[PDB]
Amino acid sequence: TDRFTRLLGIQQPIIQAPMLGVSTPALAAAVSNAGGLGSIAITGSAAEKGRALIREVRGLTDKPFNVNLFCHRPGQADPARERAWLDYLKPLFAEFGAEPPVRLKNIYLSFLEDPTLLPMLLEERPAAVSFHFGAPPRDQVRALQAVGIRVLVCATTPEEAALVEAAGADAVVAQGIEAGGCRGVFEPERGDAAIGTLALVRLLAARGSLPVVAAGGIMDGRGIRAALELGASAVQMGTAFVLCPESSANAAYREALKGPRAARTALTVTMSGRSARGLPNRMFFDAAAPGVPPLPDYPFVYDATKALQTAALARGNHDFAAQWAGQGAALARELPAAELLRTLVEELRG
Amino acid sequence: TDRFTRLLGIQQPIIQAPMLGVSTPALAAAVSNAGGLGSIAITGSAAEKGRALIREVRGLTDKPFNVNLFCHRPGQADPARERAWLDYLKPLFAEFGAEPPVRLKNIYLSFLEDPTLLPMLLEERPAAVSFHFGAPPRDQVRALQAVGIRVLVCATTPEEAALVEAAGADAVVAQGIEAGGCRGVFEPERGDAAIGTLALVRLLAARGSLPVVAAGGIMDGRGIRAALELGASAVQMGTAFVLCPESSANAAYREALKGPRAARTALTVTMSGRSARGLPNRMFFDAAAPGVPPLPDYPFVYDATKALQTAALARGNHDFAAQWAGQGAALARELPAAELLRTLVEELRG
Ligand SMILES: Cc1cc2nc3c(=O)[nH]c(=O)nc-3n(C[C@H](O)[C@H](O)[C@H](O)COP(=O)(O)O)c2cc1C
Ligand SMILES: Cc1cc2nc3c(=O)[nH]c(=O)nc-3n(C[C@H](O)[C@H](O)[C@H](O)COP(=O)(O)O)c2cc1C
Fold this sequence. Notes:
The structure is a homodimer. By secondary structure, the first copy, chain A, is of the alpha/beta class. Chain A has 13 helices and eleven strands.
C-alpha cells in the first residue's frame, strides 16, 4: 500500500469506484479530500461535458482523483434485431401508457470510437484515468502516461490481466464476481470464468506483474485487510459508497439498498446488454427463455431499457431501475463519504 | 481466533476437506497428526463400511478428525426421465463400444433416507461430523452433540446459514463460489446465488452467531490469513490437498491439476446432477441447450456418468472424468500432507 499510495499521490489505498449515474464530483472530492482516491465516470458525455465534470471535481478538491471511461468493443447497430427487441418490450411500455422508442442509439461511445476523449484528457491531466471492459492501445496508454497520468484497467481473469500488462498500464483493477454493476469481461461471447475476488486477487498478485487493486464485495476495513493479505496494493469499492449523501442515487435506490432486497443480488444481461450485478427486479429476466428474441448489442439494449425506465418513472414505478449492488450489499452503511473513508481507515488499522 | 481450535481440540484452524473419492483415512490421519482436522467422506457406503473407514482413521491417528455425510433431499426415481437421459447419452456410450445401463441407481443415500447412519455415528463418536447439501433436523444434530460430537454444516448463503443455526450446529462451513467439487446449495431448483468466498465469509461472520469455516479458493497461508481477517475461525481446503500422495486422486487427475488445464475451472450440472466445479471436459455441457432432455434427480445422474466413465476408461479415454478443483487450482502444490500442513502453518504465522 505504501507503493500504491506513493504512485497515486494519495494517503490511503482506497478508491471510491467510478459509478456511472451514481458517482458525482461531490462524492469524488469528498473521498479524495479524506485521503483516498475519489472517482467519476464520464462515458456517455461529450468530451467537453467530461471536461466540465473534471473541472468541477477540481473546484472541490486539490487532491488526486480518477476519471473513468468505458473501453468496450464499439457497439454494432442491428436495426432488425433492435426492432424485434423493442416489439418484445412493447407490453411493458404499454403498462405505463407508453410506446417503445422508434429507434435505438449508441448511447455509450467507447474510448475506442470517440477520438475526442484522449486529447481532452491529455489537456486536463487528471491524476488517474481508468478503463472498463478493455484496455486501450499501448500507444494511447503511453500518451496519457507521457503527461502526469496514472492508468488503471479492470480485468476479471488472469488472461485479461495479461492484456492489461501488455497495454502498459500502471495497475490492474481485479474485479471479482462479487462486484456490483457491469462486469469488466473483455469478450463476453467467449463466456465468463466468473472468478471470485478471493481467488482472482491472489492469482493476479502471485502470478502477475502489476499492482493489484481488489474490487468486489469489500465493504469494511476487515475486507480491505483481507484483500491486502491476498497481495493487493489497494481496494476499489463501489457499493459501499452508493448510500453516501454525495452520490446521485435516487430515493428509491437508497431505500432498496437499505432494505430487505439487499439480501440478494443477481446477474442480468437484459438491462444493458452486458452481464451486470444488482438488486433483481422486472428487468431481470431470462434472455434464453422461449419467445425472447436475440439480444441486441451493448449498449443499444441499455438505450431501450432507459426508455422503459423513463416511462415507468413517469408513473411512479421503480421496478425497472438499475439498482446496481455487489454481493456485500447487506453490509452497506449510510454515511457522509468523508466519514465513511475515515471509518474504513480506522477499521483497516485495527 | 481460538474459537474453532478450542471447539475441536486441535492445534491448527485448518480442515482438510472431506472429498468423496479423493480423501482417504491416510490423508485424514496425516493432517490430524500434523495438528489440523483431517476428514473422510463416507456417503455411498453402507453404514458398516463407513464404520470400518472410521476405524481405519483411528488406526492411524489418536487426534480429532471429521466424518462427512451428504444430507441432500433424497433423490426421486423417475424411470421415464432416466430413460430419456440415457438415450441422450447413448451415442457417447457407443463411441466406446458400450451400452448404457438399463436402470439408474440411487448411489448416494442421503443422511435423511438411511436410518442406519446415525446409530453408527453415535457409537463411533468421531470428533466432528459434517453435512453437505443440507442440515439434519435439530433433534438429530442434538443426538450427535449429546455424545460429544461437534456438528458442522456447509452453507452457501446467509439464508442457508440461518437454517444451520436453526438446526443448532456447532459451526458453519461457508462455501464460496471459488470452491471445487459439488456446491452445497440446499435447494438448487430455487437457483444459486453463487456468492464468492470473500463476500460470504464476511456476511456470515459479521451478521451471524456461529464460528465460520471459510471454504473456497484458499491455497496458501495468505489465503488463510485473508479468511481470518474476514472473521472466519478456521478454513476448509480441498483442492490444496488433492495432489498429496495420501489422496486417492488417480494419475490422470493429478497430471490434469498440475498441468495447463488448471488455468480454467467451470461449473457443470450434467456430471452428477448437482452443480459442481472442476476442470472442464466432455461432461461439461449446457443442460439448457436445445435438444437436451430434463435432468434426472441427483444422484441418479452421477450413476449414468460413472457408467460412461467406465466405458471411456476401458478405451483409455479420460475426457469424462470428474476432476474437481477450485478457482485457486493454478496455485496447487504437490507435497506429503503433513508437509503441506506445516508449510501452510508457516505461511499463516508469517
Ligand atoms: C452502481 C455501480 C456503478 C458502477 N459503475 C461503474 C462504472 O461506471 N465504471 C466502472 O469501471 N465500474 C463501475 N462499477 C464497478 C466498480 O468499479 C467495482 O468493480 C465494483 O463496485 C466493486 O464491487 P463492490 O460494488 O462490491 O464494491 C460500478 C459498480 C456499481 C455498484
Ligand atoms: C475433489 C473434491 C471433492 C470434494 N468432496 C466433498 C465431499 O465429499 N463432501 C463435502 O462436504 N465437500 C466436498 N468438497 C468440497 C470441500 O468441502 C470444500 O467446499 C472445497 O474443497 C473448498 O474449495 P477449494 O477446493 O478451493 O479448497 C470437495 C471438493 C473437491 C475439490
